[PDB]
């Protein structure tokens, strides 16, 4: 104790074609509306959907929907594995479709 | 190194009877429209149309 760690530089790389990525943002907003309005059962909150509307950062958007769709720490870590903007919404959509 | 090349004629043909030609243009244009819209998560912007 305690542990030191070196780390990589800022991940400032996000893919091209923001039209398809923001359509995927819209579809993730649709799926999260369909999720929380049907899952009040996980003690989920509805001020988590004001935290997605009116913002222009798809990274902040995707992290907002990923954390506020609550699950275990390991799957949020699996989201933290991905460096792509495009497959992270695939991960969130697949988990919410499973639930 | 390095190479030169010599050519007899400049071959290129340019459209005649352009009704069927613009039918094929519209078909390949909307086909390429349908081709680009599939890449949800790989590459290939819709910004190239």
PDB file of C-alpha atoms in Angstrom:
ATOM      1  CA  UNK A   1       0.000   0.000   0.000  1.00  0.00           C
ATOM      2  CA  UNK A   2      -0.749   2.153  -1.714  1.00  0.00           C
ATOM      3  CA  UNK A   3      -0.595   1.223  -5.383  1.00  0.00           C
ATOM      4  CA  UNK A   4       0.840   3.427  -8.132  1.00  0.00           C
ATOM      5  CA  UNK A   5      -0.278   3.219 -11.758  1.00  0.00           C
ATOM      6  CA  UNK A   6       0.725   4.679 -15.103  1.00  0.00           C
ATOM      7  CA  UNK A   7      -1.974   5.296 -17.677  1.00  0.00           C
ATOM      8  CA  UNK A   8      -2.514   6.145 -21.327  1.00  0.00           C
ATOM      9  CA  UNK A   9      -3.286   9.596 -22.759  1.00  0.00           C
ATOM     10  CA  UNK A  10      -6.756  11.162 -23.089  1.00  0.00           C
ATOM     11  CA  UNK A  11      -9.082   9.128 -25.317  1.00  0.00           C
ATOM     12  CA  UNK A  12     -10.045  11.932 -27.690  1.00  0.00           C
ATOM     13  CA  UNK A  13     -10.670   9.609 -30.671  1.00  0.00           C
ATOM     14  CA  UNK A  14     -14.283   9.085 -31.745  1.00  0.00           C
ATOM     15  CA  UNK A  15     -15.410   7.843 -35.185  1.00  0.00           C
ATOM     16  CA  UNK A  16     -16.702   9.719 -38.237  1.00  0.00           C
ATOM     17  CA  UNK A  17     -20.297   9.836 -39.586  1.00  0.00           C
ATOM     18  CA  UNK A  18     -21.899  11.625 -36.640  1.00  0.00           C
ATOM     19  CA  UNK A  19     -25.239  11.439 -38.483  1.00  0.00           C
ATOM     20  CA  UNK A  20     -25.490   7.665 -37.910  1.00  0.00           C
ATOM     21  CA  UNK A  21     -23.995   8.018 -34.415  1.00  0.00           C
ATOM     22  CA  UNK A  22     -26.574  10.646 -33.410  1.00  0.00           C
ATOM     23  CA  UNK A  23     -29.353   8.541 -34.978  1.00  0.00           C
ATOM     24  CA  UNK A  24     -28.018   5.790 -32.698  1.00  0.00           C
ATOM     25  CA  UNK A  25     -28.107   8.374 -29.876  1.00  0.00           C
ATOM     26  CA  UNK A  26     -31.786   8.936 -30.704  1.00  0.00           C
ATOM     27  CA  UNK A  27     -32.484   5.181 -30.788  1.00  0.00           C
ATOM     28  CA  UNK A  28     -30.719   4.770 -27.442  1.00  0.00           C
ATOM     29  CA  UNK A  29     -32.909   7.576 -26.076  1.00  0.00           C
ATOM     30  CA  UNK A  30     -35.947   5.687 -27.442  1.00  0.00           C
ATOM     31  CA  UNK A  31     -34.814   2.404 -25.867  1.00  0.00           C
ATOM     32  CA  UNK A  32     -34.057   4.082 -22.540  1.00  0.00           C
ATOM     33  CA  UNK A  33     -37.516   5.679 -22.547  1.00  0.00           C
ATOM     34  CA  UNK A  34     -38.997   2.250 -23.279  1.00  0.00           C
ATOM     35  CA  UNK A  35     -36.808   0.777 -20.536  1.00  0.00           C
ATOM     36  CA  UNK A  36     -37.357   3.146 -17.595  1.00  0.00           C
ATOM     37  CA  UNK A  37     -41.101   3.586 -18.236  1.00  0.00           C
ATOM     38  CA  UNK A  38     -41.415  -0.205 -18.028  1.00  0.00           C
ATOM     39  CA  UNK A  39     -38.643  -0.746 -15.445  1.00  0.00           C
ATOM     40  CA  UNK A  40     -39.658   1.217 -12.419  1.00  0.00           C
ATOM     41  CA  UNK A  41     -39.120  -2.243 -10.902  1.00  0.00           C
ATOM     42  CA  UNK A  42     -35.354  -1.801 -10.497  1.00  0.00           C
ATOM     43  CA  UNK A  43     -36.019   1.397  -8.459  1.00  0.00           C
ATOM     44  CA  UNK A  44     -34.938   3.427 -11.478  1.00  0.00           C
ATOM     45  CA  UNK A  45     -35.322   7.188 -11.673  1.00  0.00           C
ATOM     46  CA  UNK A  46     -37.016   9.544 -14.146  1.00  0.00           C
ATOM     47  CA  UNK A  47     -34.759  12.585 -13.658  1.00  0.00           C
ATOM     48  CA  UNK A  48     -32.231  10.444 -15.585  1.00  0.00           C
ATOM     49  CA  UNK A  49     -34.108  11.332 -18.786  1.00  0.00           C
ATOM     50  CA  UNK A  50     -33.741  15.091 -18.301  1.00  0.00           C
ATOM     51  CA  UNK A  51     -29.997  14.309 -18.149  1.00  0.00           C
ATOM     52  CA  UNK A  52     -30.083  13.168 -21.802  1.00  0.00           C
ATOM     53  CA  UNK A  53     -32.249  15.848 -23.462  1.00  0.00           C
ATOM     54  CA  UNK A  54     -30.704  19.097 -24.643  1.00  0.00           C
ATOM     55  CA  UNK A  55     -27.056  17.948 -24.771  1.00  0.00           C
ATOM     56  CA  UNK A  56     -24.774  17.726 -27.813  1.00  0.00           C
ATOM     57  CA  UNK A  57     -21.928  15.509 -26.541  1.00  0.00           C
ATOM     58  CA  UNK A  58     -22.584  11.901 -27.646  1.00  0.00           C
ATOM     59  CA  UNK A  59     -19.879  10.721 -25.245  1.00  0.00           C
ATOM     60  CA  UNK A  60     -21.599  12.392 -22.272  1.00  0.00           C
ATOM     61  CA  UNK A  61     -24.931  11.125 -23.654  1.00  0.00           C
ATOM     62  CA  UNK A  62     -23.727   7.522 -23.934  1.00  0.00           C
ATOM     63  CA  UNK A  63     -22.107   7.582 -20.500  1.00  0.00           C
ATOM     64  CA  UNK A  64     -25.302   9.117 -19.085  1.00  0.00           C
ATOM     65  CA  UNK A  65     -27.502   6.326 -20.452  1.00  0.00           C
ATOM     66  CA  UNK A  66     -24.893   3.677 -19.580  1.00  0.00           C
ATOM     67  CA  UNK A  67     -24.605   4.634 -15.907  1.00  0.00           C
ATOM     68  CA  UNK A  68     -28.270   5.582 -15.334  1.00  0.00           C
ATOM     69  CA  UNK A  69     -29.363   2.193 -16.666  1.00  0.00           C
ATOM     70  CA  UNK A  70     -28.280   0.551 -13.452  1.00  0.00           C
ATOM     71  CA  UNK A  71     -26.544  -2.819 -13.260  1.00  0.00           C
ATOM     72  CA  UNK A  72     -23.448  -4.473 -11.781  1.00  0.00           C
ATOM     73  CA  UNK A  73     -20.002  -2.854 -11.695  1.00  0.00           C
ATOM     74  CA  UNK A  74     -18.532  -5.458 -14.069  1.00  0.00           C
ATOM     75  CA  UNK A  75     -20.745  -4.509 -17.009  1.00  0.00           C
ATOM     76  CA  UNK A  76     -19.983  -0.803 -16.522  1.00  0.00           C
ATOM     77  CA  UNK A  77     -16.327  -1.912 -16.588  1.00  0.00           C
ATOM     78  CA  UNK A  78     -17.072  -3.810 -19.828  1.00  0.00           C
ATOM     79  CA  UNK A  79     -18.426  -0.519 -21.179  1.00  0.00           C
ATOM     80  CA  UNK A  80     -15.213   1.116 -19.907  1.00  0.00           C
ATOM     81  CA  UNK A  81     -13.230  -1.413 -21.989  1.00  0.00           C
ATOM     82  CA  UNK A  82     -14.522  -0.036 -25.291  1.00  0.00           C
ATOM     83  CA  UNK A  83     -12.722   2.800 -27.085  1.00  0.00           C
ATOM     84  CA  UNK A  84     -15.371   3.145 -29.807  1.00  0.00           C
ATOM     85  CA  UNK A  85     -18.303   5.541 -29.683  1.00  0.00           C
ATOM     86  CA  UNK A  86     -20.305   3.278 -31.982  1.00  0.00           C
ATOM     87  CA  UNK A  87     -20.227  -0.154 -30.288  1.00  0.00           C
ATOM     88  CA  UNK A  88     -20.752   1.246 -26.782  1.00  0.00           C
ATOM     89  CA  UNK A  89     -24.351   2.097 -27.668  1.00  0.00           C
ATOM     90  CA  UNK A  90     -24.619  -1.446 -29.091  1.00  0.00           C
ATOM     91  CA  UNK A  91     -23.544  -2.711 -25.651  1.00  0.00           C
ATOM     92  CA  UNK A  92     -26.103  -0.540 -23.825  1.00  0.00           C
ATOM     93  CA  UNK A  93     -28.881  -1.502 -26.275  1.00  0.00           C
ATOM     94  CA  UNK A  94     -28.093  -5.208 -25.935  1.00  0.00           C
ATOM     95  CA  UNK A  95     -28.125  -5.097 -22.133  1.00  0.00           C
ATOM     96  CA  UNK A  96     -31.394  -3.170 -22.028  1.00  0.00           C
ATOM     97  CA  UNK A  97     -32.956  -5.529 -24.578  1.00  0.00           C
ATOM     98  CA  UNK A  98     -31.894  -8.455 -22.368  1.00  0.00           C
ATOM     99  CA  UNK A  99     -33.468  -6.816 -19.336  1.00  0.00           C
TER     100      UNK A  99
ATOM    101  CA  UNK B   1      14.006   3.078 -62.160  1.00  0.00           C
ATOM    102  CA  UNK B   2      12.145   4.859 -63.414  1.00  0.00           C
ATOM    103  CA  UNK B   3       9.539   3.784 -65.933  1.00  0.00           C
ATOM    104  CA  UNK B   4       8.165   5.553 -69.012  1.00  0.00           C
ATOM    105  CA  UNK B   5       5.332   4.259 -71.193  1.00  0.00           C
ATOM    106  CA  UNK B   6       4.085   5.016 -74.697  1.00  0.00           C
ATOM    107  CA  UNK B   7       0.486   5.015 -75.850  1.00  0.00           C
ATOM    108  CA  UNK B   8      -1.157   4.717 -79.247  1.00  0.00           C
ATOM    109  CA  UNK B   9      -4.613   6.206 -78.613  1.00  0.00           C
ATOM    110  CA  UNK B  10      -6.536   7.777 -75.736  1.00  0.00           C
ATOM    111  CA  UNK B  11      -9.519   5.471 -75.243  1.00  0.00           C
ATOM    112  CA  UNK B  12     -12.630   6.799 -73.485  1.00  0.00           C
ATOM    113  CA  UNK B  13     -16.268   6.751 -74.593  1.00  0.00           C
ATOM    114  CA  UNK B  14     -18.917   9.317 -73.638  1.00  0.00           C
ATOM    115  CA  UNK B  15     -22.703   8.805 -73.428  1.00  0.00           C
ATOM    116  CA  UNK B  16     -25.036   8.429 -76.437  1.00  0.00           C
ATOM    117  CA  UNK B  17     -28.852   7.841 -76.182  1.00  0.00           C
ATOM    118  CA  UNK B  18     -28.831   9.028 -72.594  1.00  0.00           C
ATOM    119  CA  UNK B  19     -32.361   7.915 -71.586  1.00  0.00           C
ATOM    120  CA  UNK B  20     -31.267   4.390 -70.580  1.00  0.00           C
ATOM    121  CA  UNK B  21     -28.005   5.982 -69.355  1.00  0.00           C
ATOM    122  CA  UNK B  22     -29.763   8.237 -66.840  1.00  0.00           C
ATOM    123  CA  UNK B  23     -32.064   5.337 -65.865  1.00  0.00           C
ATOM    124  CA  UNK B  24     -28.919   3.378 -64.954  1.00  0.00           C
ATOM    125  CA  UNK B  25     -27.527   6.513 -63.243  1.00  0.00           C
ATOM    126  CA  UNK B  26     -30.626   6.817 -61.036  1.00  0.00           C
ATOM    127  CA  UNK B  27     -30.607   3.070 -60.299  1.00  0.00           C
ATOM    128  CA  UNK B  28     -26.932   3.054 -59.285  1.00  0.00           C
ATOM    129  CA  UNK B  29     -27.366   6.344 -57.355  1.00  0.00           C
ATOM    130  CA  UNK B  30     -30.199   5.027 -55.191  1.00  0.00           C
ATOM    131  CA  UNK B  31     -28.354   1.695 -54.960  1.00  0.00           C
ATOM    132  CA  UNK B  32     -25.275   3.455 -53.569  1.00  0.00           C
ATOM    133  CA  UNK B  33     -27.659   5.355 -51.271  1.00  0.00           C
ATOM    134  CA  UNK B  34     -28.879   2.000 -49.942  1.00  0.00           C
ATOM    135  CA  UNK B  35     -25.290   0.668 -49.776  1.00  0.00           C
ATOM    136  CA  UNK B  36     -23.912   3.501 -47.612  1.00  0.00           C
ATOM    137  CA  UNK B  37     -26.794   3.457 -45.079  1.00  0.00           C
ATOM    138  CA  UNK B  38     -25.907  -0.039 -43.796  1.00  0.00           C
ATOM    139  CA  UNK B  39     -22.696   0.874 -41.919  1.00  0.00           C
ATOM    140  CA  UNK B  40     -24.229   1.571 -38.521  1.00  0.00           C
ATOM    141  CA  UNK B  41     -20.947   0.960 -36.694  1.00  0.00           C
ATOM    142  CA  UNK B  42     -17.942   0.531 -39.048  1.00  0.00           C
ATOM    143  CA  UNK B  43     -16.915   3.363 -41.436  1.00  0.00           C
ATOM    144  CA  UNK B  44     -18.175   5.101 -44.635  1.00  0.00           C
ATOM    145  CA  UNK B  45     -19.930   8.412 -43.879  1.00  0.00           C
ATOM    146  CA  UNK B  46     -23.289   9.380 -45.326  1.00  0.00           C
ATOM    147  CA  UNK B  47     -21.373  12.649 -45.880  1.00  0.00           C
ATOM    148  CA  UNK B  48     -19.823  11.227 -49.086  1.00  0.00           C
ATOM    149  CA  UNK B  49     -23.155  11.484 -50.921  1.00  0.00           C
TER     150      UNK B  49
END
